[PDB]
Amino acid sequence: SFSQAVSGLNAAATNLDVIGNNIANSATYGFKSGTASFADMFAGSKVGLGVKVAGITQDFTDGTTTNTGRGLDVAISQNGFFRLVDSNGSVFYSRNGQFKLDENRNLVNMQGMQLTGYPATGTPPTIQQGANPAPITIPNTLMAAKSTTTA
Amino acid sequence: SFSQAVSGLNAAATNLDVIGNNIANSATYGFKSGTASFADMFAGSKVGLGVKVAGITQDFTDGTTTNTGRGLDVAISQNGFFRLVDSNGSVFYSRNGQFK
Amino acid sequence: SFSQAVSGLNAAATNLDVIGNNIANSATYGFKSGTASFADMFAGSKVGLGVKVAGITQDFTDGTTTNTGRGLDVAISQNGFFRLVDSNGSVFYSRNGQFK
Amino acid sequence: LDENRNLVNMQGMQLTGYPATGTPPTIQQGANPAPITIPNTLMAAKSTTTASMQINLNSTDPVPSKTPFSVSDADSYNKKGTVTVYDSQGNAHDMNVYFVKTKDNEWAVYTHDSSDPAATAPTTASTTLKFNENGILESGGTVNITTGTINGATAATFSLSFLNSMQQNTGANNIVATNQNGYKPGDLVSYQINNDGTVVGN
Amino acid sequence: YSNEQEQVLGQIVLANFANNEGLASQGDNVWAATQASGVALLGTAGSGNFGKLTNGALEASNVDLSKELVNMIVAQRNYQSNAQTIKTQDQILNTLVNL
Amino acid sequence: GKLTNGALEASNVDLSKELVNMIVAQRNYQSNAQTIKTQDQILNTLVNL
Amino acid sequence: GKLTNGALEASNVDLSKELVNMIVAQRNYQSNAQTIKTQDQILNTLVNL
């Protein structure tokens, strides 16, 4: 007859776990605190059989912007995320602004994700919004000389 | 269990330690301030696992060029590093402009 | 939490820094007075979040015109800037007239 | 929200509510309740049909010296304004309405199309407004004004109302009330629920 | 460059989903799309429902220490409160088995 | 960059900035400890029970 | 590697990491004590019939 009683402990532990997770990840810039969501159960006849967990919901509301300087860091103030790719080619989403250039000269975060964007093609170079996203790189090569045509 | 908390506790200590060093390193000539960056974890379930330090990051802005008046003293102005080698022969790069 | 208070702390420290820099630069021959400008934050809620630094604004009033007697030196009377190019490239703009 | 933009609780149980129908959609109190959805489809252009504008007039304004009506002459008329109206394709048509005084307490109104230079500048008076002794208008406020056709877009016809007009000396002419019932096509931005229970989307 | 010329190498693409709360965090502070979340719905940071960015700025952790500390005390008491039910169920069954 | 002669780099740290980060990190530390206090407390009640 | 005169190497122990590990170890030690008590009572009933 412990089924309803023990179910509360698991929910209480899970609720305590989420609270611990939120405070453990303090000061993390790309962090989004979650929240517990419970649900009762009734399978018999007018006797509560315990509790359930419906999943943790994060708080998507934006935080406070901070001025850290640099140039490889951007912030988002409302709806909109970033799109990132890995070595295999999977698509990941995050709101971390921390970026760096590796020896391959790619826009990469601290973990190894390649920032993606619309490639700039054409002469003169321009950004087309109808192209498939491509990793954004900064080559060391110099641009070729331009023949004057319009003055 | 402790996993949701103790790791963060450790993280907290690191967040303090990186500050203390900066407090101690407030008199060195070639120092660069450092902070920490963290990241959460997720198991198969949708419950967090804690937090681990993603890594120590360092700032690379330029400090004030204090004038001392010694002949063999030089200070960089933008992106750049002096290059040094040891007795063994390893390569190192720095910005401390103290020479003898 | 601390966000509002620490943001105000940082803004006040920045303004004090600007004032100190203005005091220090009271002798350079091409300086322009700098001032700070701030703004507050407001998220989806109704309570305030703190203050940023909207930016640093330079003053572009023309100062006095000292007469030193040298020949290789000039001073601009109104809008206009000397255009200079160092070493590799880049086009910098200045107003100081001390010419080597 | 669900995968297909449906309001739903945490357990996958679809929410219910009042179905919304009409142009513009409204709430039917007697209609059969149906699941509430928030589609992201964009609304098309809405044609301009009803417009209103109230203008305050001055009783000590002298008659213009240059009697013939001119569009590029300042004193040829008294008041000029920009009336923003939209066609069936959402294009912005700004109408230049000109006020000119011919005799005591009588005004002649002109209509001009600014977004379409191909239109002819107005020279003859469109309609006449006659204010009574006390300055309260009695009739003649409904005038039909048509837009110009550009880039294969059908002309827009709307009825302009000069209702609730006064003539007492207010010093100088000023604009306080201007509105149109036609708006350009737009896209969904954000949605919220009011305390009355309806769902309103920006 | 040194030739007084401006060039573009790309733009930052933004993806807003038709349904939030469907992004399962994986590994580091990143989120992976799946069903019950919609398509990526790429776009630019200028127009659409995608907001403006700000270079040289970073978002905070959007957490409140005061809210978590007080919820910590409430969570502990609830966790101890259920333990009383187990203890009561233990004693109530011990008397029956031993008659 | 240019190499100024007779000059040395600064410490690149401004004490006013870390003197408050230290305080907020501390308060975070006792918050954690209260968690871990609660974790010890919780486990304590269950084990003695 | 290189050496350095007039200096010594520390003990490379952090009390921050040990204290939290000591708490965890104690509970683990407390916990297993329950199993002995549980196994003791579960056998006491059987012998007493």
Swiss-Prot record, chains B, C:
Cellular localization per UniProt: Bacterial flagellum basal body
Q: Which domain of life is it from?
A: Bacteria
What is the similarity comment for this entry? Belongs to the flagella basal body rod proteins family.
Protein name per Swiss-Prot or TrEMBL: Flagellar hook protein FlgE
Q: What is the lineage of its organism?
A: Bacteria, Pseudomonadati, Pseudomonadota, Gammaproteobacteria, Enterobacterales
The gene from which this protein is expressed is flgE
Range covered out of full length: 2 to 101 of 403
